[PDB]
Design a protein around this nucleic acid. Structure first.
Ligand SMILES: [Mg+2]
Ligand SMILES: [Mg+2]
Ligand SMILES: [Mg+2]
Ligand SMILES: [Mg+2]
Ligand SMILES: [Mg+2]
Ligand SMILES: [Mg+2]
Ligand SMILES: [Mg+2]
Ligand SMILES: [Mg+2]
Ligand SMILES: [Mg+2]
Ligand SMILES: [Mg+2]
Ligand SMILES: [Mg+2]
Ligand SMILES: [Mg+2]
Ligand SMILES: [Mg+2]
Ligand SMILES: [Mg+2]
Ligand SMILES: [Mg+2]
Ligand SMILES: [Mg+2]
Ligand SMILES: [Mg+2]
Ligand SMILES: [Mg+2]
Ligand SMILES: [Mg+2]
Ligand SMILES: [Mg+2]
Ligand SMILES: [Mg+2]
Ligand SMILES: [Mg+2]
Ligand SMILES: [Mg+2]
Ligand SMILES: [Mg+2]
Ligand SMILES: [Mg+2]
Ligand SMILES: [Mg+2]
Ligand SMILES: [Mg+2]
Ligand SMILES: [Mg+2]
Ligand SMILES: [Mg+2]
Ligand SMILES: [Mg+2]
Ligand SMILES: [Mg+2]
Ligand SMILES: [Mg+2]
Ligand SMILES: [Mg+2]
Ligand SMILES: [Mg+2]
Ligand SMILES: [Mg+2]
Ligand SMILES: [Zn+2]
Lengths: 104, 149, 48, 159, 204
RNA sequence: AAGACUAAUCGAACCAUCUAGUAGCUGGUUCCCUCCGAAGUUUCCCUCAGGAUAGCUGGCGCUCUCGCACACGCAGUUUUAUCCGGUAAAGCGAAUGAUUAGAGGUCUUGGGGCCGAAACGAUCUCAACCUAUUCUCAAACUUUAAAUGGGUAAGAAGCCCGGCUCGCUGGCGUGAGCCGGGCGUGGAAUGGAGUGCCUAGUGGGCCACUUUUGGUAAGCAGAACUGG
RNA sequence: UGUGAUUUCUGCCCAGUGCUCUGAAUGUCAAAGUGAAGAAAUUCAAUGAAGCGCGGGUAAACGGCGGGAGUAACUAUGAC
RNA sequence: UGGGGCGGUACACCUGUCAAACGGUAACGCAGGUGUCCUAAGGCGAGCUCAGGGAGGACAGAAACCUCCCGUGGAGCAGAAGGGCAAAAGCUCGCUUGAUCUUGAUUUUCAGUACGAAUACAGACCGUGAAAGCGGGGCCUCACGAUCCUUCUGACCUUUUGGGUUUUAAGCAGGAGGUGUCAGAAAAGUUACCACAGGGAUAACUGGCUUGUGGCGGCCAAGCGUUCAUAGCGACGUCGCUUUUUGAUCCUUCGAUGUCGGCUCUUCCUAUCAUUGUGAAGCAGAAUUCACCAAGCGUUGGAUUGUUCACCCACUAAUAGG
RNA sequence: GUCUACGGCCAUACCACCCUGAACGCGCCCGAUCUCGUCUGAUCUCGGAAGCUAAGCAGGGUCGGGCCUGGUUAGUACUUGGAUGGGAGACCGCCUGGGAAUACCGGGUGCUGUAGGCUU
């Protein structure tokens, strides 16, 4: 789809509409010292094999898009996470869908 | 082998058993009901002698939710004299001439328990135009009462 | 091994055997679901 | 096996009748719906917002709430023996007052009057409906003419 | 390839005609529904004799064609090549399905082999139009035809005039008075309601 | 070399113990009388020979009231008013779709061709085609439109009079709520109502009238209504 | 490990799969080790074995070893 | 799962019909669709008219472009179908980002639980409009996913254990990473060397209901027969019987009814191959063909093949069927 | 008798073609400085008042097309409940109750609420 790089939406700090900048959300590392992996290590350590399941049978071919907003106003610098329906193709700030013209 | 709609209408008329009988007054409300349970009954337009023979011989009262015989007028008056009815004849007047106080006189009476027809019936599964017993047999109901009683 | 798949045969007998009872109505019904802005004034009127 | 859509089996119900498509005649809107009123329901499919479910098309109910554009209604529903009461919010153009009580209202007012006036008289006159009774012994005239005489007709293989 | 007709005689299933939902059916074996001098005016051939049905059943396109031909042959040999006009008053719109067992009873929904026509009681199947000296030949023709159908049919003369819908005793007076006009193989009734310019054109 | 032999035992010997191994599956389950008295259906489960959930059943009660000169409330019911529906039938000279035949149109494209240089000079016609009529059709078409059916209402929780409070709405006013008074039979025919806990067995179905789907049919397969 | 006296013979295919040779000159490639930042846990970087890939040899190693059309002075065939 | 396997998905969802005029209602029943697409195809305001048909105009033609008239929707509105829409919900222009932040109530499937989808209100911040007002995604009906774990956002937010400071970790509230067997296990084959608990709730023989197919037979009569509808045949059509063919079904039988064919032996049927008594021919005689009463007595020897069926030789009154 | 502004019910009010329209109105009509928008004062906006019923509108006419409503079609078709009724079956008749639609033949062709003008 297409989305522009800016808009004006609600900042839950300033209590108003203010303009934002936009960028796509990615996912971070795992940090290796969370209580989840610490357990999974103390358990997977030794003899016995594999202890917790594994996932193999997939169906989906898409992902729900997630955006990341940032108030341009300095001394606010608040951020949010916003969501969209699913799509196979995505794009930030492309063309403008010209009407009336010829296609070559 | 009877239907729910029909099982209802009979037990309003207090006919919960074979060869029982009750009087009833006539209007648009009642007559349509009788068309609904037509094949299971047999009704008619009676005279005075039949009212006598029913009430004296086979005619009992409902008292304290019990069934008690009409042997004396104390019973009638004590339960029913606030309407100006103190004896047998006052009923019969109230019944034969459908009066103002009909509902109470009839509901005082228990439904009559009769015996099977001496002589026989033609065919109970049909109407009284095709050689049967069902439906309306207007004046000939009295001929039958002579043989049930 | 095949079987039956749907039936509503006997059910009306089951339903009426205990009855079909309409709900029990009361006066002074409940004020659950009405407009907030109207409900509010009722309080203030009764508060004075 | 059937599906579960919200408009399955409504080709004709949520369909406007013949030569009555178009804009809405707007005495529908200008009516007054106060609390306690008895109301019947009929889904107009010309406008899709706030319309009720199939199960309430043709049912009658009673008001409990009033909004800017809609009404709250209490409706009964028979579902597997037990009956339930239900509170559906519905917009105006799917409703209509019901004449199913105006007859009662004409009576009680006429009946209050007819009691109070003609009370000084002393008689307790009839006040309450009675069914259709039997039909009044009377005469019939043959103003001269003998009646007609009918009989059946022979069959014919007309077609 | 074709079955007997006891398998498909009764009006059991609902109509399943030829449309955008049912595709893949052949045509019918009958295609012509009237014969003889089919141009004659209303006055030449005033007599009509019909075949009438007495059952609620189904008749096949083959039956109709066979009956059509037997009647034509005798009727030619009797009267002439142009002494009559014959018309068939049924059409095969309903379709027949066949399940061929070369699984068993799984996936049972047939293939459109056939066409057939439905009949009600009192309907008409065949009709002939001719002159009055040839009455008995008309009866003889149809009698040969009933042996091609599965049922009990019967024959009767009509009081009408030809293939019209007006009684003979009235027709002849009623054409000499400008209510009925002979526009072809039929007539055209006209009432006293339109605009008078059509009353001016007539009566002149 | 045959999966053959290893103490009458071998596609993993025998002896004791773990060991009363586990079993949604088969077979069995010990005296009497009285009383009430069923289901084989919904949704979910690596569920289809099984469980949970609701329904059907029983027992234990409790709040009330009446022929106690004394009343309300209910109902596989009728009546009077009043709404809902698009099935049977009917219709196609009314829409969508299909289809037959001839009369007034070379409408008009062209002719195995047509009397001819051929043309719309004629004259036909055909795949279709203008006008008025005509024969036959619809589970997935319809202007029209039933019978049986479903929902409300039939009064004291009603009607009327007067006055108070309100950040709600506002030409002035409406609306809702609180207070204090005056007025009892409100169509038929029937009978005692209500409410709360614990709770088993079931969860394989079968037939008949009528309507009805697939199939040539079935003592065949799958459904709606009531009764067995 | 395969075939099965003698006689007379043992044809082509290293694409697939296995086996096998070398190899610092190239990606990838663990622990420990080396160094920089941090208040310290810690993080980062460079490094870099066998193996897998890159490349050769092998079928008395598992094994595998094609279709259409025209054509000869009667026709049919069909060397071409 | 009309025995199982191969096939298909009727395993989560949408439209119409079947469905018997409220609602609800089944089968590997009919016809079709889905796992998407959109910075506008969302939202406000203004202005206008669609499909086609006719008549005209330089090149211009069946069709480029201009103009007039008729035009109740016969066009379009992302996709399947259905409903609905004309100074719109369609086409075109101007401005924008209600596709935002936050509680609770109701409806739909339903146990009257959850997901999802939807509706009417209230508080904020806003956009468009002269204003009434409209808008918190797509005109409506479908387009999607729990605990446990991980990652990101937020508050000068609580805890980190005898007290204090800094880092890390754990917590609270909201999104995402996914389970299509779609109320949600982490998962390949073969057994003729095989085994156990059960099953006629389920198959491979007989029997039973049906008779499509197979066999046998009638009706009417266009033609054949040089001539001549009917000596003998008989199209196109149509009414039936039989269970010595193969199917459909799955009622009895799974704690056991011994599964092909030949050898042997008895009885029964008739839909008559011959023999007895007769009728009819396109019956001169001799041979042959149709039919009637009739089941009394007969219907063989051998090469081939496991054969039932087939086929040839040889004799015979005859070498018929069950 | 009738018009103007705003409307409710939305064809007894629509479609085609012909006749008449006193007074008040309603419109046609004359221009483009400024307001406003157009490729083009044609539409839209503004400023006007010489002339006109031709048109629009109003009423009226058509053995008018359609629409509204009666009758006939017809106690027909169909239908609740019933029977040890018929029949080889398909289907038919009867008892008790309810009850349609086409063709065809007649009639009608806008009702009105609020505010204000003309009809001296
Ligand atoms: Mg280790
Ligand atoms: Mg005796
Ligand atoms: Mg007897
Ligand atoms: Mg009976
Ligand atoms: Mg079951
Ligand atoms: Mg329907
Ligand atoms: Mg069928
Ligand atoms: Mg072996
Ligand atoms: Mg034990
Ligand atoms: Mg068992
Ligand atoms: Mg089990
Ligand atoms: Mg029909
Ligand atoms: Mg239980
Ligand atoms: Mg070797
Ligand atoms: Mg070799
Ligand atoms: Mg190799
Ligand atoms: Mg299975
Ligand atoms: Mg129904
Ligand atoms: Mg607009
Ligand atoms: Mg839109
Ligand atoms: Mg808001
Ligand atoms: Mg510590
Ligand atoms: Mg500390
Ligand atoms: Mg083997
Ligand atoms: Mg056969
Ligand atoms: Mg079997
Ligand atoms: Mg069985
Ligand atoms: Mg079965
Ligand atoms: Mg044995
Ligand atoms: Mg034995
Ligand atoms: Mg014989
Ligand atoms: Mg001008
Ligand atoms: Mg004028
Ligand atoms: Mg004029
Ligand atoms: Mg007219
Ligand atoms: Zn901010």
């Amino acid at each position: 789809v297409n989305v522009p790089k800016t808009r004006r939406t609600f900042c839950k700090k300033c209590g108003k509409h203010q303009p934002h900048k936009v960028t796509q959300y990615k996912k971070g590392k795992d940090s290796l010292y969370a209580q989840g992996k610490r357990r999974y290590d103390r358990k997977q350590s030794g003899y016995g094999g594999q202890t917790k399941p594994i996932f193999r049978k997939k169906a989906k071919t898409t992902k729900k898009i997630v955006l990341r907003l940032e108030c341009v106003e300095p001394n606010c610098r608040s951020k949010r996470m916003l969501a969209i329906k699913r799509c196979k193709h995505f794009e930030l700030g492309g063309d403008k869908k010209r009407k009336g013209q010829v296609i070559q | 082998g009877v239907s729910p709609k029909v099982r209802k209408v009979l037990q309003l008329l207090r006919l919960r058993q074979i060869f029982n009988g009750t009087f009833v007054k006539l209007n648009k409300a009642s007559i349509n009901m009788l068309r609904i349970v037509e094949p299971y009954i047999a009704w008619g337009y009676p005279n005075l002698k039949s009212v006598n023979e029913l009430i004296y011989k086979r005619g009992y009262g409902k008292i304290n939710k019990k069934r008690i015989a009409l042997t004396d007028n104390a019973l009638i008056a004590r339960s029913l004299g606030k309407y100006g009815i103190i004896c047998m004849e006052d009923l019969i007047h109230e019944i034969y001439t459908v009066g103002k106080r009909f509902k109470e006189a009839n509901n005082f009476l228990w439904p009559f328990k009769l015996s099977s027809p001496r002589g026989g019936m033609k065919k109970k599964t049909t109407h009284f135009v095709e050689g049967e017993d069902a439906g309306n047999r207007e004046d000939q109901i009295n001929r039958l009462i002579r043989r049930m009683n | 091994a095949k079987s039956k798949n749907h039936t509503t045969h006997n059910q009306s007998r089951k339903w009426h055997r205990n009855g079909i009872k309409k709900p029990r109505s009361q006066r002074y019904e409940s004020l659950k679901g009405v407009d907030p802005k109207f409900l509010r004034n009722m309080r203030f009127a009764k508060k004075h | 096996t059937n599906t579960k859509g919200k408009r399955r089996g409504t080709r004709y119900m949520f369909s406007r009748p013949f030569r009555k498509h178009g804009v809405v005649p707007l005495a529908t809107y200008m009516r007054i719906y106060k609390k306690g009123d008895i109301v019947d329901i009929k889904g107009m499919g010309t406008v899709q917002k706030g319309m009720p479910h199939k199960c309430y098309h043709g049912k009658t109910g009673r008001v409990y709430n009033v909004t800017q554009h809609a009404v709250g209604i209490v409706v009964n529903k028979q579902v597997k023996g037990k009956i339930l009461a239900k509170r559906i919010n519905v917009r105006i153009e799917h409703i209509k007052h019901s004449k199913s009580r105006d007859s009662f209202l004409k009576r009680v007012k006429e009946n209050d009057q007819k009691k109070k006036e003609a009370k000084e008289k002393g008689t307790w006159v009839q006040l309450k409906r009675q069914p259709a009774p039997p039909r009044e012994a009377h005469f019939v005239r043959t103003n001269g003419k003998e009646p007609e005489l009918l009989e059946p007709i022979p069959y014919e293989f007309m077609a | 390839g074709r079955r007997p007709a006891r398998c498909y005689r009764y009006c059991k299933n609902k109509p399943y005609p030829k449309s955008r939902f049912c595709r893949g059916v052949p045509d019918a074996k009958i295609r012509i529904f009237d014969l003889g001098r089919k141009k004659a005016k209303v006055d030449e051939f005033p007599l009509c004799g019909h075949m009438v049905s007495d059952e609620y059943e189904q008749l096949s396109s083959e039956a109709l064609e066979a009956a059509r031909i037997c009647a034509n042959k005798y009727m030619v040999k009797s009267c002439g090549k142009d002494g009559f006009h014959i018309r068939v008053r049924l059409h095969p719109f309903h379709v027949i399905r066949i399940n061929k067992m070369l699984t068993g009873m799984r996936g049972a929904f047939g293939k459109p082999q056939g066409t057939v026509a439905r009949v009600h009681i009192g309907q008409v199947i065949m009709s002939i139009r001719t002159k009055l000296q040839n009455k008995e030949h008309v009866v003889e023709a149809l009698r040969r035809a009933k042996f091609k159908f599965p049922g009990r049919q019967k024959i009767h003369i009509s009081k009408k005039w030809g293939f019209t819908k007006f009684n003979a005793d009235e027709f002849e007076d009623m054409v000499a008075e400008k209510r009925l006009i002979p526009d072809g193989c039929g007539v055209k009734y006209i009432p006293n309601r339109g605009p008078l310019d059509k009353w001016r054109a007539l009566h002149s």
